[PDB]
Amino acid sequence: VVIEPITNEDLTTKVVDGTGIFDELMTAANAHLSAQWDMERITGTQYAEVYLGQLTAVLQQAVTFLIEKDKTYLNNLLINAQIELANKQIELADKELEKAD
Amino acid sequence: VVIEPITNEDLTTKVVDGTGIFDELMTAANAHLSAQWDMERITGTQYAEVYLGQLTAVLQQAVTFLIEKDKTYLNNLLINAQIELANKQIELADKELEKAD
């Protein structure tokens, strides 16, 4: 696999509909907000109050996800490799039992 | 097993009925909310107030589950392999007792 560097443009594109992770999380939260607002359930003021109220915790979640995405994928690959190595060690344990008799 | 990379599209699809984990958790919470609301127990304003009030903690739970799902599965597989290796070591301990006599 080819790992890519974590740059500033992977978190925020500095645009509302950006391609970053924080921008995508904002777009996803705004999707639910718009779905609720299209049913005259919230006024524009409450729409902006809720949308802007999550500007500082969704950022935390986006940062946490960005830091622990590729690391998690690589760790899963390493765990799979270790499982294969454990199967090989089981086979070697069978051979060890034979050379023991 | 084939491990898949953890991408942005696995958390949020940026749609209300998305295929991500956060989107599925929102759909599940909305299912209970709709079940309660179909019995005239909550007004639309309270429906949106409760639905939007969990937009920042359900995100935390979705992130935690997404990070620790494949890792947990691989760890369980490794634990099973270690249990098999422990059984093999018990057999080798029996052989060790024999070559001891």
**B9 DSSP assignment:** G
Give chain A's length.
101
What are the b/e assignments for A44-80, b being 16+ CB within 10 Å? eebbeebbeebeeebbebbeebbebbbebbebbeebb
Find out whether A50 and B52 touch, Cβ atoms under 8 Å: yes
Angle at A35 between CA A34 and CA A39, to 5 degrees: 100
Q: Do B48 and A42 touch (CB under 8 A)?
A: yes
Minimal Cβ distance to B51: which of A27, A36, A90: A36
- Give A29→chain B minimum CA distance, Å: 8
Q: Percent helix, strand and coil across chain B, each rounded to 5? A: 70, 0, 30
> How many whole angstroms separate alpha carbon A63 and alpha carbon A69?
10
Is B26 an interface residue toward A (CB < 8 Å)? yes
A–B interface: beta-carbon pairs under 8 A: 117
Q: Which of B76, B12, B73, B58 has the alpha carbon at shortest distance from A28? A: B12
